[PDB]
Each structure stands twice: as C-alpha cells, then as structure tokens.
Amino acid sequence: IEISEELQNYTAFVNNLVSSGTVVSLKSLYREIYENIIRLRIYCRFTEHLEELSGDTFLIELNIFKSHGDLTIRKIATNLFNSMI
Amino acid sequence: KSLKHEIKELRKEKNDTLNNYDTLEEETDDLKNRLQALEK
Amino acid sequence: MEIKEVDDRAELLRYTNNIPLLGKLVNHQPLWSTNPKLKSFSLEKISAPDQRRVQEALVVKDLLNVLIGLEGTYIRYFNDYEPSDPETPIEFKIAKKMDPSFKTFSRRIVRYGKQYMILTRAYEKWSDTSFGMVLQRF
Amino acid sequence: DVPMSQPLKEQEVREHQMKKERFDRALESKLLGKRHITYANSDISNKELYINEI
C-alpha cells in the first residue's frame, strides 16, 4: 500500500507538471523529475526481494536504512518502517 | 578471471578500431575534396 | 542532417547486483562513435565569416548537451569511454574542423561537462551503505 | 658556576612514583593488558541488495 501511495503521488506530480504547461524543454522536465526518479529508484531497489523475504526481515533492513545520510533514502525508509511497524 | 581477460582484449580491439576509423575517415575526406575539384 | 537507422530501446538494466542504491537503472543511449543517429554535417562548410554564427549556434547546442554529460554532434566522448563500466574515464573529443576560438571555448566548457558527469557518478556510487553516513550526506 | 644536583624531594618523589608505576605496569601485563591492537576481519551487507557471484 505504501508502494501504491508513492506511485499515485508520482502520477499526480507528473500530471501536474504536464498539464501545468510550464515544461518547455526536455532538460527542464528532467530537472523537475530528478528527485522523483531518485525516489522511484529507492522504491524499486528496496522491494526487489519482496516475494523472497518476511516482514520482520524488511523491518531489520529498514532499521539499517533509517540511519542513511541521504535525507531522501532515510525519509523513504522511515515511512516504510512506520507502516510495517 | 577468464571473463575479465576477454573484456580487456575486446576493449583494446575496440579502441584500436576506433582510432583506425578516424585515420581512415581523414583519408576519405581528402579524397572527396580532390574528387569534388576533379568533377567540377 | 540526414537520419541514420539504429536500434534504440530504453529498458531497465537486467542485472542490478553491482549497482549502488542510487545507481542508474536504465541502459546508456547509443554512442556516436558506434551508432550515430545523424550524418554529421561537417563544420568546414560554415567556416565562412558570414556563416560563422551558424557554426557558433551548432557548437552552443553541442555544449548545452555536453554540460549534462550527453555527447553532442561535434563534441563526443573519446574512444576509451565505455558507458556500461561505471569506473570508465571521461573526456570529450572536439571536432577538429571546428573554428579554433570555438574549440578553445568548447574545451573550457567540456571541463564543466566532464565534472558534472564525474560528480553524478560520484554521488551514485557513494549512496551505498558501505560508505558511511558522512559520505552519504556528502 | 657549579654542576649542582637535581632537586631532592622531587627526586625521591619521582623514585616512589616510578616504583608504583612499574608495579602497576607489571600488574597490567600479567592481566594481558587493558589495551591491545586489532584489524577488521568482516564487512556488512544488506538483504535488500544481496549478492552471490559476478
């Protein structure tokens, strides 16, 4: 459900960009979705072994990642960990 | 180790081929310029 | 400039075991050296002092594309650039038929383009867990 | 003008302190020491990002 919430947030953001008419070049678009590409990278690397792991193993890995220096990775791990906890 | 060896040999061949390509293109262009003068 | 026909499929990477946490997950676009998508219009044909601004504009376009690591039509990665290998070296080679002032300015801007490539690769690498939260925050 | 001697009270205090320090060092050495030296034999990895072969 957290993955789906992130996907829906990303869809909403992409549609606001597109229909906002404020993107005029591909460089500007790539600049706008830089952090959303980062967030999708995080959400797609965390859940690679989703079918092969258990909820408590996810909890341990997310506890390891909640101390990440990268504020975005730590935010994402904190949200996932909070839901699962 | 064997896979890393093959990678190194293939990377070298690639670099030599690309360097040869540029040398050849320069010859090709000189010939084109001479020909354009001759066909003109 | 006339189109060339090459296969350009943008897909995720198949094996992601040796990729950092924030490493790029797509594959690299076709390089100009192996798979050029345009026939390069040689710059010698706009070297006349009247067509100088046309070559200027083409070089400025190539420079705006190099500034984010993307090789241009007349400014390209050099021969030893291997995009799959992440520890590859990064330099740009500039069209030898370019106006020498444009070559000088283009080398100056290529410095910044290469710095951008290396710094992007650097934070991608340092996003791992084996690097510590100080390097991760950097 | 002359090569006088070091202080006397300070000298004997130093001798007593050196006796005590030698005793304490021998006692520590007999207890395998309280400080030693190391090298790290193992590294972390994460089950979210696991590896086995190249």
Curated annotation (Swiss-Prot), chain A:
Intracellular or extracellular location(s): Nucleus; Cytoplasm, Cytoskeleton, Microtubule organizing center, Spindle pole body
Coiled-coil residue windows: none
Family that this chain belongs to: Belongs to the TUBGCP family.
Protein role: Involved in microtubule organization by the microtubule organizing center, the spindle pole body (SPB). Probably part of the microtubule attachment site at the SPB.
Subunit structure, as described in the record: Interacts with TUB4, SPC72 and SPC97.
Additional record remark: Present with 56 molecules/cell in log phase SD medium.
Protein name: Spindle pole body component SPC98
Protein species of origin: Saccharomyces cerevisiae (strain ATCC 204508 / S288c)
From Swiss-Prot, chain C:
Domain of life from the UniProt record: Eukaryota
Disulfide bond sites: none
Something else known: Present with 2230 molecules/cell in log phase SD medium.
Subunit (UniProt): Interacts with TUB4, SPC72 and SPC98.
Family according to the record: Belongs to the TUBGCP family.
Biological function: Involved in microtubule organization by the microtubule organizing center, the spindle pole body (SPB). Probably part of the microtubule attachment site at the SPB.
Name listed for the protein in its UniProt record: Spindle pole body component SPC97
Origin species: Saccharomyces cerevisiae (strain ATCC 204508 / S288c)
Section of the entire sequence shown: 1 to 138 of 823
From Swiss-Prot, chain D:
Subunit (UniProt): Homodimer. Component of the SPC110 complex containing at least CMD1, SPC29 and SCP110. Interacts with SPC97 and SPC98.
Protein name, as recorded: Spindle pole body component 110
Family: Belongs to the SPC110 family.
Subcellular location: Nucleus; Cytoplasm, Cytoskeleton, Microtubule organizing center, Spindle pole body
Misc: Present with 279 molecules/cell in log phase SD medium.
Reported function: Component of the spindle pole body (SPB) required for the proper execution of spindle pole body (SPB) duplication. Potential role in cross-linking filaments or anchoring other molecules. It is essential for growth.
Complete-protein stretch covered: 112 to 165 of 944
Name of the coding gene: SPC110
